Amino acid sequence: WDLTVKMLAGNEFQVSLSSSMSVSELKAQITQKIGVHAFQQRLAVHPSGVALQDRVPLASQGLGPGSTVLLVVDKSDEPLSILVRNNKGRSSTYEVRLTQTVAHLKQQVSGLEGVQDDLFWLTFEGKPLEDQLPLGEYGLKPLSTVFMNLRLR
Amino acid sequence: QLQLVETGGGLVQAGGSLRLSCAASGRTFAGLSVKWFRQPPGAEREWVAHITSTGSSTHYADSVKGRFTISRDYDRNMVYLQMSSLKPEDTAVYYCHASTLWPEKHQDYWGQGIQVTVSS
């Protein structure tokens, strides 16, 4: 499948899906093209103009070979507060931007818990957070709880 | 560079009020996330309050919610902790703390730490 992406400001590029044909593959290609994370891509099917739903087959939302989607990028970087439960079980808020890395969150927690950053690890909904990836790739929300655990040695 | 200067501590009777202050003396508080912590006698340092960098959220630990108020006077580089209905259990050394925010390089700043003794 070759789809057209039309950025609202006006410019057009083309992506190829050949793997899964999901919203993920599409967004991955747009990342390769214009360097913005999946969570920053607001996509809509043309011509209806409705949103593309994440976690739904593209062919289910009326998208086939040669169709075009409309792309708005929303750097989704307005600060929000999240909860961090630490390894002693106590919770406190932390101000973050979904555009920051997990590594940057670990630096904030390191500074306040007094533990070197490589001596602990973080999880959201049980999924271990990778240092290089932005918080928004994990779907964090106002007052989500990241759990901290020690890499006890 | 930034230093955080704390004032306002001291001795209060149970049921009284205190306004702690945290002056931003190096640069302004712009773009910094600011928290108060306290350390009760022979206890872990515990989190108390939080005002975010845009000054538009506040968060409190359960032990102080309803009694304590965090706020900022932005024109004057000030973050306050308003403590009312103080109990003897609020006796602790109080610290204010500031964090930068992505995409700024992460740094932590800490006030010196002031004593609050609540007496009955």
Author numbering:
A (entry chain A): 3 to 155
B (entry chain B): 1 to 120
Excerpt from the paper describing this PDB structure:
ISG15 is then transferred to substrate(s) in an E3-dependent manner, primarily by HERC5 (13), a process referred to as ISGylation. Nanobodies are the recombinantly expressed variable regions of the heavy chain–only immunoglobulins found in camelids.
We obtained two ISG15-specific nanobodies with nanomolar affinity by phage display of a library constructed from lymphocytes of an alpaca immunized with ISG15: VHHISG15-A and VHHISG15-B. We confirmed their distinct binding sites, with VHHISG15-A targeting the C-terminal Ub-like domain and VHHISG15-B recognizing the N-terminal domain. The asymmetric unit contains three independent ISG15–VHHISG15-A complexes, which are practically identical (RMSD = 0.6–0.8 Å between complexes). Structural analysis of the binding interface showed key molecular interactions between ISG15 and VHHISG15-A, stabilized by a hydrogen bond network. Within the CDR3 loop of VHHISG15-A, L101 and W102 interact with R99 and H106 of ISG15. Additional stabilization is provided by interactions involving S33 and K35 of CDR1, as well as R45, H50, T52, and H59 of CDR2, which engage with S83, T95, E97, and L114 of ISG15, reinforcing the binding interface. The addition of VHHISG15-A abolished proISG15 processing by USP16, whereas VHHISG15-B did not.
